[PDB]
Amino acid sequence: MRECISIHVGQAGVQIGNACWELYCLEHGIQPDGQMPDSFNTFFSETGAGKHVPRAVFVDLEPTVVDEVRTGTYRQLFHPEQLITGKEDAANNYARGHYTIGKEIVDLVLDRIRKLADLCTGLQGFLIFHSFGGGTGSGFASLLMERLSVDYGKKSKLEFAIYPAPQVSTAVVEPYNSILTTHTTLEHSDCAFMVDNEAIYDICRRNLDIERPTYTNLNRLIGQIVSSITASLRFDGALNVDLTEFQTNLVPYPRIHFPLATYAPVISAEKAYHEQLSVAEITNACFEPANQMVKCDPRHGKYMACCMLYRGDVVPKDVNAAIATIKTKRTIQFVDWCPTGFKVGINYQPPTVVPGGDLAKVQRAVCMLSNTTAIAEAWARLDHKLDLMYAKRAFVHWYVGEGMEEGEFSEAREDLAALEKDYEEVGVD
Amino acid sequence: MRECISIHVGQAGVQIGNACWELYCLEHGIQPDGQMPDSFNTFFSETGAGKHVPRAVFVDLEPTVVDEVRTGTYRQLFHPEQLITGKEDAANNYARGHYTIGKEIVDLVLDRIRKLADLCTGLQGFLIFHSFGGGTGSGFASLLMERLSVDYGKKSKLEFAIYPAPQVSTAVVEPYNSILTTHTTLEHSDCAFMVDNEAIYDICRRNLDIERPTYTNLNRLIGQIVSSITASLRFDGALNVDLTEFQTNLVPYPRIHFPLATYAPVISAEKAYHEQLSVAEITNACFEPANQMVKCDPRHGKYMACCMLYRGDVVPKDVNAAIATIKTKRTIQFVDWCPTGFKVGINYQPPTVVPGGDLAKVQRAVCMLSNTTAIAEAWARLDHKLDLMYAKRAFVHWYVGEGMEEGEFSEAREDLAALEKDYEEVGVDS
Amino acid sequence: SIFSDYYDLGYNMRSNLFQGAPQETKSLMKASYTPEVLEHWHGRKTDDLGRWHQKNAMNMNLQKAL
Amino acid sequence: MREIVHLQAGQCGNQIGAKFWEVISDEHGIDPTGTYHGDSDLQLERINVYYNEATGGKYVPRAVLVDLEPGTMDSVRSGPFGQIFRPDNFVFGQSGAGNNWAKGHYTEGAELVDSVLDVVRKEAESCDCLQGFQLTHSLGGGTGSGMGTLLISKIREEYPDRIMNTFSVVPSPKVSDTVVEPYNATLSVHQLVENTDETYCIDNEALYDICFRTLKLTTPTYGDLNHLVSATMSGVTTCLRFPGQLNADLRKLAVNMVPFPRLHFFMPGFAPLTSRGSQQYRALTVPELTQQMFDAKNMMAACDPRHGRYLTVAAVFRGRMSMKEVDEQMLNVQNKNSSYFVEWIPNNVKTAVCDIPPRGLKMSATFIGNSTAIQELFKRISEQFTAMFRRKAFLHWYTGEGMDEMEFTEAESNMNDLVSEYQQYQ
């Protein structure tokens, strides 16, 4: 009944979705062709054939990454009307994805979202998979937020975004398109899950004992965390955490809504052969600074609100035992004005592993979301990165040439300045 | 519940640990895979599938003794994280392996004893295995002692170290390595155990019928000795000793903590077919000086404290007879202050014969610990060895280059001189 | 005899000084430590009430910590 | 479907494009008859980018092929892949320009730009979406610089949003094939700066160095020369045509590769270059590719990057590989040499990965670079021009067909503006 709509924007979003929907089909009985040989309601609309269509919209301005979905092994699952293809790429330019080429295709994807929500009596929120350092994921998505916050009212907006790593970088203009989107998507989102790329490379190098995995092994982990988020909307549990209480716990203020991601049991097959994983050790490994899915130091920051989503075979007694040892650890700096600070969700369905996957069959799984203040450190780092580009009129001609005023660039800097000064203000005693 | 964490630093520690852990897995019913086809709790950890990860921390700066384990028959037994390897060598240098390349990896190994102790319901103390001669076992051991003293604290650090022998020696700078490493055993270690080589060589030569003994035959005896002392935590008896109990009964001073460990019924198969290793005849065999595991002369010193741990079919009634026969003698000469000086342990399980070894099993095995003041007369000779080499400052330039001042040899000499008078002043009394 | 060319090269190599025969030499601890691998007190069989007391010991240790 | 319209001009451009269409038809499995006979299904999914559909399964290429003297056409047509180009694209004249820029630009050049525009505009408007124009010509010649510059001028005043992508052949340092090419280079650089958005610079003797010292060839002909050009020709549009985990088109390189409109002069490279004698001794992976494309003696220009400063740099990969080796060694080449790259741009390396390798190698790459070291070539062209304009050395064969004498001073005064602008960023 409680059905959610996922929107994938850009090359990164499409490639994340291509691995998340695999495990979405695998966890239920849905075959790649669409057949199954009521828990599947929240993601798969059931037609009368026994064939299930997904509730997702794949949209990209470059057709090159979407045609492999149309000709791949999932060609008979998606609705062909869903996979929206553009004509010309945005090509790392925010203005090309905002004003001129991105303006033509927003009405079609808006109509598709409306017709997908017409068949949705239990609309709860949005699961947006857009990128920050790209062309269409940062520019085309901002128009989508602009339209949905004025057309669909006060609905939940959960972004699973990719943020640029401090060290590993792909484009050379990505500080621009990262800074540009935060001006208007700050007030047009309710929570934003920040994900980098380098920290997950450390995760698959250090915790996973395999060398040279690819983007697929990273998108598999992103699919796993996005599955554990919506575990309480489809399976029975002791304390089900709906999608609405997530932000009742996490976000305190109308301008601090930027939590963090962490997935603890990421061990391999030979590790599962030897070490047994109960609740306490995976809760301890969850709070490790180096197990984080973002390159940041959590000890510098202060946690403000955290929620735990336990999955599999757990009993509540040692869940309540395991969080008490976190209260007495002075190394973890909790904030002085949140004495409760915790939320617990339980599901009885154990996590599943894809065939040919990287993880192994485990019995317990914990996924962590926490509003911290190290994200302000990451934002100050990106602000310093961008500040050594506007000093001498660099790369502006691509922007002011195509329908973007030069007066935007001065305002976004001071808007982010107010944002980080507010973020550091609330972290004090 | 009663658990010990083993840290096996250095190549000698790794080889002795391979022998000792083979003995431990043979003592219980654990296959080398990890499956049995509550006595394993001290040295293992039961998992859900029936696996059992041993609680060992195998650390060395070389792969050639650690990956040599990884290709062995116990590759599936050990969790792959605790087989810690390095890149380059300490290379017979206390200074190098303690200051230069030990620093980059001592922050990594310390994160493993933390995870082992987080799985520990109750930890009783550590059991370090290294050697006083080489480079890793003298610098890394000192770093481990100081870091565990800062970190954990009020535990019972057992130290099973291998001493340089008076006559047989391999390294040249091994007096330099052995003298320097006493600055953490004296302060930051709460108990210790010297063993030298030539005593084990002579025991294999005379008590055993074997000649030409390889180095596995030494580590098997050391593993039997270490299985004897920790036998009471796994199997207690009529008179059980505890790891925090015998520490208070083996030191009179916070500085005299260097006992001597023997396993009395070392015996062969042709040798032991004729006699009976009874209670009454192996107790005076515990004090035979050529059965001492350290090549020192106990006739020239006075016994100060003692602790005898039996193992197997022992009745308490003739132990008092054995304790009464010893004190009446003239050659076994004691300290005037303490008249009793004896604590006795009883256990009901006989030793486990290793298939492939030489020690044919007896039923009454006794492990013997004695605090003797004669071991200081085996320490002035090492001081003489260091004095004859420090006269013209030989081999010094390879220590002063690695960020350490030349004068620490001299202050080590003052410490050893001030340590000798502690054994001088005891024994003689009003 | 499937490795005859290796031996034919090696002996014609070192028939000048080092004449012998081809063996296989395992390491010493791969020949000593090998697949060769009633019991009074097979364990201190603590059960039920002792397990309850162990959990008690943990629980009031963390309780007096609080 | 992102469409590229190809132009050639001169005996340079005709032969270089002949090898380019050779290797492209080899990659897509297209016969000399024009029919497909390849194996994989991925060679037909974006076949339309470089070829036009025709009946009979014949893929006629989309390129205009023009040169004044028709003696070069008879060499292209009688070649191995000379029967696939349309004869309507075979536009020519009757009198060759013959090493004079002004001959090809004003008097007779005005008499054929209409005839070639009538086929360029005919092929361009039959396109679903148009990406830009890709042109192959010579800088030191007479019919490349003389005439093809007029085509770029006439296109850019008519298609004011399509990208310009030129592969020019600059004069060599120590050997000159013409005697007048300082004039032609000075007159063409001044007109290529305010119009084109992406210019590539290639030289003959540096590629001789490549096929001598690296490929270990015995008799380096012009065929292997043009094959090495065609390797970096095809590698730049290899993500616009094939699938991969992270693709980049020409506009991505344009926006990641220029900081300012007047700094868009590039220089190319090709990474997996090894001889036959060292084939079995090379470990073909990522690390030697990233250490080889960085090497100065693997480049296609006579300017050492040691003397210049890299502003931004692109690197397009090809094949099947993991992506943290890629980015970790881009980090290594940005961190080992901080004196090679500008400190006022945070990230200077652009990467893109395809999936299908070239026919004959497991892994491959293609280096593109905007360096300040290209200022060392233009200052040499200007010093030649000042040594030649000082007494009107060859000027009377230029003003004889209606040139202004003063325009030569404007050409120098706008050429050295590029040198001044590159010098400010060093």
Next chain:
Amino acid sequence: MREIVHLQAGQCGNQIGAKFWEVISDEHGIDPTGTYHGDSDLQLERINVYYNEATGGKYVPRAVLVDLEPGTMDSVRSGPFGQIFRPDNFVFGQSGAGNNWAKGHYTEGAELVDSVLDVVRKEAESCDCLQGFQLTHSLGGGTGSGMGTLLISKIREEYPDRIMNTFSVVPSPKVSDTVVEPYNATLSVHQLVENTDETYCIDNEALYDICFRTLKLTTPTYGDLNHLVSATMSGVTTCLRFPGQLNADLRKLAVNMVPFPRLHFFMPGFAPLTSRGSQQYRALTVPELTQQMFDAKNMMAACDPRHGRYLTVAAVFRGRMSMKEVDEQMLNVQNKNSSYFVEWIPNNVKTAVCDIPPRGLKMSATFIGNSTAIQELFKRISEQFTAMFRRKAFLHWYTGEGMDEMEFTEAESNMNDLVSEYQQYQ
């Protein structure tokens, strides 16, 4: 890992190294093609100490080959195991050296030492960790002692904290092969006392006496001499590649053996040497091995240790053992020979027992000595220098290269200095 980069300089060094690499390939089971041939799985986990991985199951060496004459490189490639080497590591001079130390160090080595440094900088960065270096020399000629010292003086200056165990064939005391040998040997030994931590001393008539009066070889070529030298080479680094009881790498040997920063002239030998007819007449064990090790007719230097004092002694053992015989006999030998061993060190002998033996024998040892009998071999070259130099004989072949006549005075000053420090502990 713990990997060694090899260098071969001069004709003698190249001919010795072409036997060293090729007995090593025998020891690890590598064919002349480069693939695997061995019988055991023990020959591959430590293959990376000497070899580099190549695709296709092939294995290539890690060595740079340097000389001033293409003939020796032709002879190296013409051998049975010459084709395994990479050809881009072959960097050589192409005009002769003249047996001039001055020409091989200043006029001809200065051109070549840059490219050799480039190749060794490429090869040293191809490993995660580098243990140290290895070089084969010849202290009599000019192309194997002129730039090899130049190689070392620009390796210590750039890689300051590693191991260089150079091996040198010292000039003869009684007979000779070049009339300018004392000059080159003194000029090389002036630089081998400053920047080198381990050096070796090899004397050709010791090889001759071993192969005549012990091996009973009627016709000894130079190949057998390099076979003996390479058998000494293989035993030192066996603990790096093969497991054993009491392992000891090169830093172990360095720290134990040489006590002072200057007394590092070694004295190497190989114990189980016997003729064919006497093999079935002797038992094969450690009691006879220690004698054949300590026998001076199994020694590679013509200086009796009876006339001097043994400072420290190493013995790297191989094969199946039982280390009571190893430990107790180094006590027995010191007890009987108390006068020869020094008194201020209690134990002069270090043993290191490995388990995997060389092919052919099970009872193998590598003698390493540090004795004060080196000065009785070094007076015999200081006297030759002081006879040649005082008559002002051969200097214009050195004065013509910018080095003046006074430089030789520091060489003999350091010579008498070294002789003085050897005499302090006699």
